[PDB]
Amino acid sequence: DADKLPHTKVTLVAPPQVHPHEQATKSGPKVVEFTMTIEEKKMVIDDKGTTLQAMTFNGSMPGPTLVVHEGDYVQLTLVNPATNAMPHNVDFHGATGALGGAKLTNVNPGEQATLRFKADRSGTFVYVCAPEGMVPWHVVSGMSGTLMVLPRDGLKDPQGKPLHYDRAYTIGEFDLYIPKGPDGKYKDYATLAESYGDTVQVMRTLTPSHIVFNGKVGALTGANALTAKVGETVLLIHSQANRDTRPHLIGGHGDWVWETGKFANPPQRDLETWFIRGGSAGAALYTFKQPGVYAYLNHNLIEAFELGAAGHIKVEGKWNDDLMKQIKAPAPIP
Amino acid sequence: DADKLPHTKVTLVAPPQVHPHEQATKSGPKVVEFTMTIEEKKMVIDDKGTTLQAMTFNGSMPGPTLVVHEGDYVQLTLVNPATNAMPHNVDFHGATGALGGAKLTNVNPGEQATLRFKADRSGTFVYVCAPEGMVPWHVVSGMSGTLMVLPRDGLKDPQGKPLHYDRAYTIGEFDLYIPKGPDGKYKDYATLAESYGDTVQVMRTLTPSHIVFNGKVGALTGANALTAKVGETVLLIHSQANRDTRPHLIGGHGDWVWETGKFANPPQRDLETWFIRGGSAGAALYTFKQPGVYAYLNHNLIEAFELGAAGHIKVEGKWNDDLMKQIKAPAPIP
Amino acid sequence: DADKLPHTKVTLVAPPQVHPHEQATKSGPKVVEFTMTIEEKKMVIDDKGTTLQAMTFNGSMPGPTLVVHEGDYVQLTLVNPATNAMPHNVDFHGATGALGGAKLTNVNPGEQATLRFKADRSGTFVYVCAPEGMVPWHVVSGMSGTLMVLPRDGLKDPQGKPLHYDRAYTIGEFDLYIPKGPDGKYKDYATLAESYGDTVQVMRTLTPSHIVFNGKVGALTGANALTAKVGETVLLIHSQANRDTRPHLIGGHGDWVWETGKFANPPQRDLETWFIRGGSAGAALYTFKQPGVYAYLNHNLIEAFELGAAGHIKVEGKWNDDLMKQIKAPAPIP
Ligand SMILES: [Cu+2]
Ligand SMILES: [Cu+2]
Ligand SMILES: [Cu+2]
Ligand SMILES: [Cu+2]
Ligand SMILES: [Cu+2]
Ligand SMILES: [Cu+2]
Ligand SMILES: [Zn+2]
Ligand SMILES: [Zn+2]
Ligand SMILES: [Zn+2]
């Protein structure tokens, strides 16, 4: 029975970090308790000062990543404070029944609820807010994240050999649909409700105005680049709740990749570009071998460089001339 | 020789049903005979009354699904009645040679033809009408369906263990390109020929006006939802002859999925979202475990909720609190 | 050490051909030397006379395909003649470090450089020109190609049995973004620099004006169709450096396909349509069984027939009535 089974409480951390946790483990199943608080807020999303009337789980885009093990039970308390204006709920793609939990978590401002479901399938799974009649608006406005359910004995390769990561990072990619006025400038709205009609009309064209990692253009560059060092293995979790994307690590590879995101399937090796289907999360492992700066981006280069879907990873260590060597620097042509 | 081999005659049924048939079987190869009649017709495709100058195999979008077994021969009589205005033909992606049969089935109104080909490869395969110089118009106007070629010993999992379905359903997804007039309202045309030029211009923008399952917005909801019960396995066949889509069962999963649609390959398990490439059909199995209402949709949520790509499945039975439990209903925040 | 190891010099040939080479081989690793010269040029890209201010590796779109074996070292001399106006560089997705080599190959007009990297992973990999601040423009203007790294013992099927091709062909697919003037006609530019601003604005809409194989509408049809004969196996290499595409051989199949393009993974069999992610190259094998004309195209049929993404293959030999037979030619309906 899930009733008896020890309970545990997890504290969440802001993306792109993922909360400390175990890969392989000797512990038996548990009821893992989490809490999240919805926050509607206006956010600045680019270098020219454009804003989005946004909606978030826990104040961030994307929401925090939740980690449990196969066979555990997830038990979430979802809170919607009186300071918000809309109702919300939650749908876990990793769960079975009731539209992922949406039908049992409908919360008006000033209310809360508690849902439990069994995490009986391994992989990275999207969760979203899906209120009847406003599903796409809430999702494109920022209300998505990932639940990672790891196998009890850790990750495995196609032959059943063990795989591991030394660090984990989580990246949410958001296609945004910001309206413009007759002067061709983007519109700035006083409340969340007033942005609605105009936004639906942009959505229907299927052309995003911006496509961003973790809330804004440049969120993962400069002081905020991801970091690693030569010899370390990183797990890159990538979610896209509404639209397809194609991650690529410029200067590196996907060593082992589950593009559909489900760990009971064998991963593919040596990828240059992988593919995340809209409405899913995927995962890639890579072991660094050269120091320097890498670009982790959506490899439709217009979507990356013009629209915003690109970040940086800064890697420390020693250069490997066997792997790569500048034989003759740029010089005049004889 | 295919000449000698018993012949059999199959009677087709309207989507979303699939005609009775056997999975595993002791019968040897046969020549399976089918007939289809082309029907051009104006159809209502949404809740505001918009119409499409449509073209169909057998009066439906999509055409009926044809089922045979690996090693059988398909023998189709294609009829184009004098009441139609355009010529047509057929291209089976499951066949080898002559552009899938198009070059041997060109039929003007008042004519018919008969084609035979060997179904030597297992999977779900699209068929379409492809007349020289008008290929995309006929396809986007409704002329596509699926041929399912099952392995003689039935479906198998990656380890070679047997899989089965208790029911089958077939869903065709159609990206439509309906023109608008200077007043911004959709155009209504007196004949099929007059819709042509305007439609080509919308097509070239790559933005559909509507995206629908089985002919229209809401075709698979309300009195027309699909049905199942807890403990039953369903096979969901999904075709898209022109554009990519990403099926997802909200509240459930793809237990075993062949996203490229070819049964000699091992399927993937536990998927949240799968991917059907434009110009192919794919297949997913799922065993229900909770009763209620599920949404089966394209998980670009704008394409699903705003443009039309979504249906419903109504499932009867007993609720499972181990799988999912509402711990604390929505209530005021302490 | 890579220093000692015999060197060899390869001479490149224009697409769609691939330079003679060995599949399985008894030779040990080598340092394989290549040279490429960048050429900016105005090109005619359609049947109405539209031009593109283009940028190429070696005068062609796509660039030539380079072939080495796993464990070899690639050593490229990249030359940028004084007659060009822009700087350029190179990023090999098959390489490790320094943004694929871009950071060590920045060459202004009148300069050259030489890069070496170890090809330690099997598959077809895209290479591109990626200058800081102008990455998407150079790529969409024509600066991409494929490096094929074959396994030392040749290609293998999922069970480890040997596979081979008798011929190879290489196809690059280019999404183009040509601006229009107030009269709705496409613009013709005097220099490469003057096309820039207008092109960026079209790019940002994500709607290509044209989508072409190997530089232009019809590049692979008529006198320029690909060729084969019944009983022969062909390898079709397909690259798309910026946008997703879905190859399909009308009248045939993908017998064995590596859609992500990495040969250490098992291929899928019997495909009708496969999928090349933007920023990657993929590969398919097919053995012809019927003579005639086939269409090799992108199976979004609008992108193929209206925008340009389609070619032809002309196959000689004897017709097979077991595989396909016209039973009753088109005739009046009784
Ligand atoms: Cu919400
Ligand atoms: Cu969902
Ligand atoms: Cu037709
Ligand atoms: Cu086709
Ligand atoms: Cu360049
Ligand atoms: Cu790249
Ligand atoms: Zn490690
Ligand atoms: Zn059953
Ligand atoms: Zn051969």
Short mmCIF file of C-alpha atoms in Angstrom, two decimals, chain B:
data_model
loop_
_atom_site.label_atom_id
_atom_site.label_comp_id
_atom_site.label_asym_id
_atom_site.label_seq_id
_atom_site.Cartn_x
_atom_site.Cartn_y
_atom_site.Cartn_z
CA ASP B 1 3.04 -17.44 -58.64
CA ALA B 2 0.60 -14.86 -57.42
CA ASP B 3 -1.80 -16.02 -59.98
CA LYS B 4 -2.70 -19.14 -58.35
CA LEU B 5 -3.25 -18.38 -54.71
CA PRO B 6 -6.73 -18.11 -53.41
CA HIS B 7 -8.50 -14.75 -53.73
CA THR B 8 -10.59 -13.11 -51.03
CA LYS B 9 -12.88 -10.07 -51.03
CA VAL B 10 -12.82 -7.52 -48.20
CA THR B 11 -15.64 -5.09 -47.36
CA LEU B 12 -14.40 -1.69 -46.07
CA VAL B 13 -15.92 0.33 -43.20
CA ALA B 14 -15.89 4.05 -42.44
CA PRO B 15 -13.17 5.62 -40.21
CA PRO B 16 -12.51 5.75 -37.34
CA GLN B 17 -13.34 2.06 -37.37
CA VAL B 18 -11.17 -0.50 -39.13
CA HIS B 19 -12.66 -3.56 -40.89
CA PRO B 20 -12.64 -6.87 -38.89
CA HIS B 21 -9.42 -8.81 -39.41
CA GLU B 22 -6.94 -11.23 -37.84
CA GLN B 23 -3.65 -10.39 -36.17
CA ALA B 24 -1.64 -13.63 -35.91
CA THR B 25 -2.85 -16.15 -38.50
CA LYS B 26 -2.37 -19.69 -39.84
CA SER B 27 -3.51 -18.79 -43.35
CA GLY B 28 -1.00 -18.63 -46.18
CA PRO B 29 -0.73 -15.76 -48.68
CA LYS B 30 -3.74 -14.63 -50.69
CA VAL B 31 -4.79 -12.08 -53.26
CA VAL B 32 -6.95 -9.67 -51.28
CA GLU B 33 -9.47 -7.73 -53.42
CA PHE B 34 -10.74 -4.23 -52.54
CA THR B 35 -12.72 -1.52 -54.27
CA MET B 36 -12.84 2.25 -53.67
CA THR B 37 -14.90 4.99 -55.36
CA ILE B 38 -13.67 8.60 -55.56
CA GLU B 39 -16.10 11.35 -54.51
CA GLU B 40 -15.53 15.10 -54.89
CA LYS B 41 -17.79 17.03 -52.50
CA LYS B 42 -18.13 20.34 -50.64
CA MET B 43 -17.81 19.77 -46.87
CA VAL B 44 -18.43 21.83 -43.72
CA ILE B 45 -15.22 21.76 -41.65
CA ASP B 46 -15.75 23.93 -38.50
CA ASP B 47 -18.32 25.28 -35.97
CA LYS B 48 -18.72 28.65 -37.89
CA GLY B 49 -19.77 27.01 -41.16
CA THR B 50 -16.68 27.23 -43.25
CA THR B 51 -16.61 24.87 -46.22
CA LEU B 52 -13.91 23.03 -48.13
CA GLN B 53 -14.07 22.00 -51.77
CA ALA B 54 -12.99 18.46 -50.91
CA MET B 55 -11.83 15.29 -52.68
CA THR B 56 -12.14 11.82 -51.08
CA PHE B 57 -11.58 8.11 -51.41
CA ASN B 58 -14.99 6.50 -50.61
CA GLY B 59 -16.68 9.67 -49.31
CA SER B 60 -14.58 10.09 -46.13
CA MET B 61 -11.52 11.98 -44.80
CA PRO B 62 -9.40 10.05 -44.41
CA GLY B 63 -10.04 7.18 -46.75
CA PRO B 64 -10.77 3.77 -45.23
CA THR B 65 -7.91 1.76 -43.79
CA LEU B 66 -7.00 -1.42 -45.76
CA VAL B 67 -5.56 -4.43 -43.84
CA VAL B 68 -3.61 -7.37 -45.30
CA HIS B 69 -0.75 -9.59 -44.10
CA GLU B 70 2.91 -9.57 -45.09
CA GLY B 71 3.28 -11.73 -48.21
CA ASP B 72 -0.25 -11.07 -49.48
CA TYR B 73 -0.99 -9.25 -52.74
CA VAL B 74 -3.21 -6.20 -52.74
CA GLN B 75 -5.56 -5.95 -55.73
CA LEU B 76 -7.50 -2.68 -55.94
CA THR B 77 -10.18 -1.57 -58.33
CA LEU B 78 -10.28 2.24 -58.36
CA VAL B 79 -13.41 3.88 -59.78
CA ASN B 80 -13.88 7.49 -60.89
CA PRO B 81 -17.59 8.16 -61.68
CA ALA B 82 -18.83 10.45 -64.45
CA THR B 83 -20.21 12.84 -61.78
CA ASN B 84 -16.67 13.95 -60.79
CA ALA B 85 -14.82 16.69 -62.66
CA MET B 86 -11.12 15.86 -62.21
CA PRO B 87 -8.94 12.87 -63.07
CA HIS B 88 -7.27 10.94 -60.25
CA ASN B 89 -5.05 7.91 -59.46
CA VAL B 90 -3.38 6.09 -56.51
CA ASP B 91 0.12 5.76 -55.00
CA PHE B 92 0.62 3.17 -52.28
CA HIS B 93 3.70 3.84 -50.16
CA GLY B 94 3.56 0.15 -49.24
CA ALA B 95 4.18 -0.84 -52.90
CA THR B 96 7.24 -1.08 -55.20
CA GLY B 97 7.34 0.58 -58.66
CA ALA B 98 5.62 3.03 -60.97
CA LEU B 99 5.41 5.84 -58.39
CA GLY B 100 3.47 3.51 -56.04
CA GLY B 101 0.91 2.69 -58.77
CA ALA B 102 0.02 6.25 -59.81
CA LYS B 103 1.36 5.71 -63.36
CA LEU B 104 -0.96 2.71 -63.89
CA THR B 105 -4.11 4.06 -62.33
CA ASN B 106 -4.69 7.40 -64.07
CA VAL B 107 -8.48 7.55 -64.38
CA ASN B 108 -10.60 10.27 -66.01
CA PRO B 109 -14.24 10.69 -64.86
CA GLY B 110 -16.21 7.66 -66.17
CA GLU B 111 -13.25 5.27 -66.04
CA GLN B 112 -11.76 2.67 -63.70
CA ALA B 113 -8.62 0.51 -63.39
CA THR B 114 -7.26 -2.42 -61.43
CA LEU B 115 -3.85 -2.60 -59.82
CA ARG B 116 -2.05 -5.43 -58.08
CA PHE B 117 1.09 -5.20 -55.97
CA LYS B 118 2.83 -7.46 -53.45
CA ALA B 119 2.75 -6.27 -49.81
CA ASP B 120 6.20 -7.55 -48.92
CA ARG B 121 7.00 -5.18 -46.01
CA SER B 122 5.25 -4.89 -42.61
CA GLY B 123 3.88 -1.59 -41.16
CA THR B 124 1.28 1.19 -41.57
CA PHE B 125 1.83 2.95 -44.95
CA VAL B 126 0.12 6.02 -46.43
CA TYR B 127 -1.65 5.89 -49.82
CA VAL B 128 -2.53 9.07 -51.74
CA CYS B 129 -3.88 10.45 -55.06
CA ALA B 130 -1.03 12.04 -57.05
CA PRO B 131 -2.02 13.41 -60.50
CA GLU B 132 0.80 14.98 -62.52
CA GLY B 133 0.88 18.74 -62.02
CA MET B 134 -1.70 18.78 -59.16
CA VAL B 135 -0.15 16.56 -56.49
CA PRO B 136 -0.34 18.81 -53.35
CA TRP B 137 -3.87 20.14 -54.08
CA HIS B 138 -5.43 16.65 -54.26
CA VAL B 139 -3.62 15.48 -51.09
CA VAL B 140 -4.46 18.60 -48.92
CA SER B 141 -8.06 18.48 -50.26
CA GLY B 142 -8.56 15.04 -48.60
CA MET B 143 -7.18 12.24 -50.80
CA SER B 144 -5.14 10.07 -48.35
CA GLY B 145 -5.48 6.98 -46.14
CA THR B 146 -3.57 4.02 -44.63
CA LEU B 147 -2.73 0.47 -45.67
CA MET B 148 -1.75 -1.65 -42.66
CA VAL B 149 0.38 -4.71 -43.47
CA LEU B 150 0.59 -6.94 -40.37
CA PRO B 151 3.31 -9.54 -39.78
CA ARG B 152 1.98 -13.11 -40.28
CA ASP B 153 2.71 -14.01 -36.64
CA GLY B 154 1.37 -10.72 -35.25
CA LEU B 155 3.13 -7.79 -33.57
CA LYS B 156 6.20 -8.29 -31.35
CA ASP B 157 8.14 -6.35 -28.66
CA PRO B 158 11.94 -5.63 -28.77
CA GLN B 159 12.72 -9.04 -27.19
CA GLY B 160 10.39 -10.87 -29.55
CA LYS B 161 7.50 -11.38 -27.10
CA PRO B 162 3.93 -11.18 -28.47
CA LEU B 163 1.84 -7.99 -28.42
CA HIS B 164 -1.86 -7.57 -29.29
CA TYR B 165 -4.68 -5.06 -29.56
CA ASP B 166 -8.34 -5.69 -28.59
CA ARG B 167 -9.66 -2.83 -30.75
CA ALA B 168 -8.31 -0.61 -33.56
CA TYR B 169 -9.03 3.04 -34.49
CA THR B 170 -7.74 5.08 -37.45
CA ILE B 171 -7.19 8.86 -37.39
CA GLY B 172 -6.20 11.03 -40.38
CA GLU B 173 -4.89 14.55 -39.66
CA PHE B 174 -5.46 17.18 -42.36
CA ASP B 175 -3.73 20.57 -42.66
CA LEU B 176 -6.21 22.76 -44.63
CA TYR B 177 -5.58 25.97 -46.57
CA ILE B 178 -8.89 27.89 -46.92
CA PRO B 179 -8.71 31.33 -48.64
CA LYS B 180 -10.24 34.57 -47.33
CA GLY B 181 -11.80 37.55 -49.13
CA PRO B 182 -11.10 41.28 -48.63
CA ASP B 183 -13.58 41.33 -45.72
CA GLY B 184 -11.49 38.69 -43.89
CA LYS B 185 -14.17 36.02 -44.10
CA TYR B 186 -13.43 32.59 -45.58
CA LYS B 187 -14.47 32.10 -49.23
CA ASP B 188 -17.25 29.74 -50.35
CA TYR B 189 -16.84 28.36 -53.90
CA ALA B 190 -19.47 27.15 -56.41
CA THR B 191 -17.27 24.47 -57.98
CA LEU B 192 -14.04 22.57 -57.16
CA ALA B 193 -12.16 24.18 -60.11
CA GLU B 194 -12.83 27.81 -58.91
CA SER B 195 -11.17 27.17 -55.50
CA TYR B 196 -7.83 26.22 -57.07
CA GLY B 197 -5.82 29.43 -57.66
CA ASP B 198 -6.75 31.06 -54.37
CA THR B 199 -5.82 27.82 -52.47
CA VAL B 200 -2.38 27.52 -54.07
CA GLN B 201 -1.57 31.04 -52.80
CA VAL B 202 -2.52 30.13 -49.17
CA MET B 203 -0.60 26.82 -49.45
CA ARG B 204 2.61 28.70 -50.42
CA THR B 205 2.58 30.54 -47.08
CA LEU B 206 2.90 27.18 -45.24
CA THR B 207 0.33 28.32 -42.65
CA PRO B 208 -2.81 26.18 -42.45
CA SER B 209 -6.14 27.87 -41.68
CA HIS B 210 -7.35 24.70 -39.92
CA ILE B 211 -5.82 21.41 -38.81
CA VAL B 212 -8.46 18.66 -38.28
CA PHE B 213 -8.87 15.02 -37.40
CA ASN B 214 -11.12 13.00 -39.74
CA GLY B 215 -12.57 15.89 -41.70
CA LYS B 216 -13.59 18.56 -39.23
CA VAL B 217 -13.22 20.33 -35.88
CA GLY B 218 -14.78 18.08 -33.26
CA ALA B 219 -15.11 14.99 -35.48
CA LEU B 220 -13.95 12.79 -32.60
CA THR B 221 -15.71 14.39 -29.58
CA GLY B 222 -19.18 14.25 -27.98
CA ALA B 223 -21.44 11.62 -29.53
CA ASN B 224 -18.45 10.74 -31.73
CA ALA B 225 -15.66 10.22 -29.10
CA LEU B 226 -13.69 6.96 -29.39
CA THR B 227 -14.49 4.39 -26.66
CA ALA B 228 -12.73 1.78 -24.51
CA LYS B 229 -12.81 0.18 -21.05
CA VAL B 230 -10.21 -0.44 -18.35
CA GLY B 231 -8.13 -3.55 -19.18
CA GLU B 232 -8.49 -3.22 -22.92
CA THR B 233 -5.62 -2.60 -25.39
CA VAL B 234 -6.27 -0.17 -28.28
CA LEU B 235 -4.20 0.44 -31.42
CA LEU B 236 -4.22 4.06 -32.55
CA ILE B 237 -3.28 4.44 -36.23
CA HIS B 238 -2.29 8.04 -37.17
CA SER B 239 -1.59 9.26 -40.73
CA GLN B 240 -0.45 12.66 -42.01
CA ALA B 241 0.24 12.67 -45.75
CA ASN B 242 1.61 16.26 -46.05
CA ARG B 243 2.86 17.75 -42.75
CA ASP B 244 4.56 16.65 -39.47
CA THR B 245 2.44 16.09 -36.32
CA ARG B 246 3.08 14.96 -32.72
CA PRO B 247 0.38 12.71 -31.15
CA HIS B 248 -0.12 12.59 -27.35
CA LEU B 249 -2.77 10.86 -25.12
CA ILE B 250 -3.42 13.24 -22.20
CA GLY B 251 -3.80 11.14 -19.04
CA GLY B 252 -2.11 8.13 -20.65
CA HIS B 253 0.94 7.07 -22.65
CA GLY B 254 2.15 5.27 -25.68
CA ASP B 255 2.95 1.82 -24.12
CA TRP B 256 4.55 0.50 -27.31
CA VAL B 257 5.05 2.87 -30.32
CA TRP B 258 6.31 2.52 -33.87
CA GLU B 259 6.53 6.28 -34.73
CA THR B 260 7.97 5.64 -38.26
CA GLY B 261 5.29 2.93 -38.59
CA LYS B 262 7.30 -0.13 -39.69
CA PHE B 263 6.70 -3.31 -37.64
CA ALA B 264 10.01 -5.11 -38.40
CA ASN B 265 11.68 -2.48 -36.14
CA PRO B 266 11.47 -2.67 -32.32
CA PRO B 267 8.97 -0.24 -30.79
CA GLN B 268 9.74 2.31 -28.03
CA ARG B 269 7.98 2.18 -24.66
CA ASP B 270 6.49 4.68 -22.18
CA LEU B 271 6.27 7.66 -24.59
CA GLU B 272 4.51 10.87 -23.61
CA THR B 273 4.52 12.33 -27.19
CA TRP B 274 5.45 10.59 -30.49
CA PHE B 275 6.22 12.01 -33.99
CA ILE B 276 4.59 11.23 -37.38
CA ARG B 277 6.68 12.51 -40.30
CA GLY B 278 4.70 14.27 -43.11
CA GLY B 279 4.04 11.63 -45.78
CA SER B 280 3.81 8.62 -43.32
CA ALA B 281 1.51 6.70 -40.92
CA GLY B 282 2.47 5.55 -37.44
CA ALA B 283 0.99 3.27 -34.75
CA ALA B 284 0.68 3.16 -30.97
CA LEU B 285 -0.72 0.58 -28.47
CA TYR B 286 -2.13 1.58 -25.03
CA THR B 287 -3.84 -0.49 -22.28
CA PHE B 288 -6.29 1.55 -20.25
CA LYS B 289 -5.95 1.55 -16.44
CA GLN B 290 -8.23 4.43 -15.36
CA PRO B 291 -11.78 5.28 -16.44
CA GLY B 292 -12.81 8.72 -17.60
CA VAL B 293 -12.09 11.08 -20.45
CA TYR B 294 -8.81 11.37 -22.20
CA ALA B 295 -7.73 13.81 -24.91
CA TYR B 296 -5.90 12.38 -27.94
CA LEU B 297 -4.29 15.39 -29.68
CA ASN B 298 -1.43 17.05 -31.62
CA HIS B 299 0.78 18.45 -28.83
CA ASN B 300 1.48 21.75 -30.44
CA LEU B 301 -1.40 23.06 -28.28
CA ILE B 302 -2.19 25.95 -30.63
CA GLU B 303 -2.61 23.49 -33.53
CA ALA B 304 -4.80 21.33 -31.25
CA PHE B 305 -7.02 23.87 -29.44
CA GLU B 306 -7.09 26.84 -31.80
CA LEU B 307 -6.83 25.05 -35.19
CA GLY B 308 -8.72 21.78 -34.54
CA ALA B 309 -6.29 18.86 -34.03
CA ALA B 310 -7.83 17.11 -31.01
CA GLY B 311 -10.31 14.36 -30.14
CA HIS B 312 -11.65 12.51 -27.08
CA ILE B 313 -11.67 8.96 -25.74
CA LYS B 314 -14.39 7.91 -23.19
CA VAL B 315 -13.29 5.01 -20.95
CA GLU B 316 -15.55 3.03 -18.56
CA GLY B 317 -14.53 1.15 -15.40
CA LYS B 318 -13.24 1.39 -11.81
CA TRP B 319 -10.89 4.11 -10.47
CA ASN B 320 -7.45 3.12 -9.14
CA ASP B 321 -6.25 5.04 -6.06
CA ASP B 322 -2.85 3.36 -6.10
CA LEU B 323 -2.25 4.83 -9.58
CA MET B 324 -3.75 8.25 -8.65
CA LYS B 325 -5.41 9.80 -5.56
CA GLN B 326 -6.77 13.24 -4.70
CA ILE B 327 -5.33 13.65 -1.20
CA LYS B 328 -6.74 17.11 -0.38
CA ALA B 329 -9.40 18.68 -2.60
CA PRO B 330 -9.12 22.36 -3.48
CA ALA B 331 -9.69 24.38 -0.34
CA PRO B 332 -8.81 27.76 1.18
CA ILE B 333 -5.18 28.37 2.02
CA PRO B 334 -4.40 28.21 5.75
#
